[PDB]
Write a protein that binds this ligand. Structure first.
Ligand SMILES: *C(=O)[C@](NC(=O)[C@H](C(=O)O)c1ccc(O)cc1)(OC)[C@@H]1N=C(C(=O)O)C(=C)CO1
Ligand code: NA
Length: 263
């Protein structure tokens, strides 16, 4: 049974694991600590991108608008922004790509600025019927992952449901939805996490994150060979494991959850 299997992973690895597998319409299929709070860390970038795209859908933003910045805007982890800084800008489109596929923190901060900041991301979550997820800080302080702290948190179920809405629901235009899906499929940081626990024949897109205090997270959508559509969130705090082992833990959790998909 699922509860036993995750419980053992937790004991053997000295780790805290939260999981939610939801259907295309957002119903919970299987979960473990599904309603408990975990820090989003980079996983917030997925709904951040969707907010930007929905502003584009509304004619409130242009995908080729230039977002200007200088060296003082850079962060420790900003590999695309470090590349473009001499030109003085990244387009909205380049920023969306970079934030999602490379987890670039300067790109993410540019997009937070464009959308009106953490409160307006929080308002977006509420507009989607997510009454739990919230953003309070920007990069890189949003990743502190202090025990008990509610700032910059979600729950496995709330994020899974939110992502199911963005990817499979009709909040976004067909155009924007397709762009978001394809960017996530092409994520460069998720090859050893949830996707590693799923059959290679399934279509998979995802957004990963790492936090202080050993946080390591992934949320993925997938489409099986039978065309059935799911979202899986996996949020972990495993301070006693090494880096690659945190990834293997997530992939092991995905391989367990996968058994609750029909086919
Ligand atoms: C998002 O999770 C990620 N990390 C951070 O924003 C944060 C920081 O830049 O201080 C951080 C970095 C390294 C850590 O070990 C812990 C926290 O965004 C840059 C980044 N995202 C990843 C991802 O797969 O998406 C990473 C592997 C590294 O964390
Ligand atoms: Na795979």
């Amino acid at each position: 049974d699922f509860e036993h299997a995750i419980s053992d992973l937790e004991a053997h690895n000295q780790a805290k694991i939260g999981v939610a597998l939801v259907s295309e319409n957002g119903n919970l299929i299987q979960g473990y600590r599904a309603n408990e709070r975990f820090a989003m860390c980079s996983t917030f970038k997925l709904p951040l991108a969707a907010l930007v795209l929905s502003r584009i859908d509304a004619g409130e933003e242009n995908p080729e608008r230039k977002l200007h910045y200088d060296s003082a805007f850079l962060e420790e982890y900003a590999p695309a922004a470090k590349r473009y800084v001499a030109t003085g800008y990244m387009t909205v489109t380049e920023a969306i790509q970079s934030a999602l596929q490379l987890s670039d923190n300067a790109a993410a901060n540019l997009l937070l600025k464009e959308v009106g900041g953490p409160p307006l991301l929080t308002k977006y979550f509420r507009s989607l019927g997510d009454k739990v997820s919230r953003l309070d800080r920007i990069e890189p302080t949003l990743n502190t992952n202090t025990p008990g702290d509610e700032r910059d948190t979600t729950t496995p179920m709330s994020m899974a449901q939110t992502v199911s809405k963005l990817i499979f629901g009709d909040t976004l235009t067909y155009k924007s939805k397709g762009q978001l899906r394809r960017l996530l499929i092409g994520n460069q940081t998720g090859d050893k996490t949830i996707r590693a626990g799923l059959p290679d024949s399934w279509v998979t897109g995802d957004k990963t994150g790492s936090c202080a205090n050993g946080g390591r997270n992934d949320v993925a959508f997938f489409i099986t060979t039978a065309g059935k559509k799911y979202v899986l969130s996996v949020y972990t705090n495993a301070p006693e494991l090494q880096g690659e082992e945190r990834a293997l833990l997530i992939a092991s959790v995905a391989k367990l959850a996968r058994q609750y998909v029909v086919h």
